[PDB]
């Protein structure tokens, strides 16, 4: 089950719907894909068969 959503995840008593920074965080996170890194951070293109 895929899930495409950019709504803010709240981690506190105060509700967040469009505010982030103090206890509410944007759910996506970007890889820092560089060729300077070693073996444990390289971008592996993974294809699966079901």
């Amino acid at each position, epitope marked *: 089950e895929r899930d495409i959503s*950019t709504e*803010i995840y709240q981690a506190g008593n105060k509700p967040c719907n*469009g*505010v*982030a*920074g*103090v206890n509410c965080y*944007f759910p*996506l996170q*970007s890889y820092g894909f560089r060729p300077t890194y070693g073996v444990g951070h390289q971008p592996y293109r993974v294809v699966v068969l079901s």
Partner: antibody
Amino acid sequence: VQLVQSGAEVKKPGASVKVSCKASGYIFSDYNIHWVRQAPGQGLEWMGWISPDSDDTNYAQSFQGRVTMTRDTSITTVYMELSSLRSDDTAVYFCARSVGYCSLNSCQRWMWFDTWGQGALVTVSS
Amino acid sequence: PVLTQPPSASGPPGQSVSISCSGSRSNIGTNFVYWYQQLPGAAPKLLIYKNDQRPSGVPERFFGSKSGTSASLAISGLRSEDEVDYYCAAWDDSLSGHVFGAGTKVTVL
């Protein structure tokens, strides 16, 4: 590194002006460029980006057909033509390089224009 | 869309001054905000990225932060470099691109 660009001069309204930006030193297959103008009496305004390694092109929500953007990978230069120049466009156009790489719409949160280049003032009059 | 900025903010040397930059619900509050300064007759550079950090070659007196849907920048020590203008660069979804502030002029008393 240096990101020198070539300016133009005064010209009649409604024609096409070509501005070019040249890159050197760094590898021109990993970094996006951005095109922002600066007019006297106001601040910066953003137009769009292209990519050196692909045919991606994105436009602002106000300039959909007034500007078309061109890539020259072999010469390591990037070109912009402006179509149907208005009167309130006498500005200084800046070739700006941002670190990283984005093509998607939602990617643009992490980009900042790191290595700017010197701009040139182009004008509209009669 | 665009952001509201004071046209002119000034402060005497020896202490600090603060520059505000408000935003809408989906302009600052979901996206990062960056601070740009430019010399007169020159090209702009980068001062604050990811709302807290600084690049190498920038002194430690330039600090900025945000709490809710607005951000503030504070500079301490105004001798010859803080007379330049500052811009509040961010990103939103309505214009689908980078949006900039009107422009803040900083002077000394």
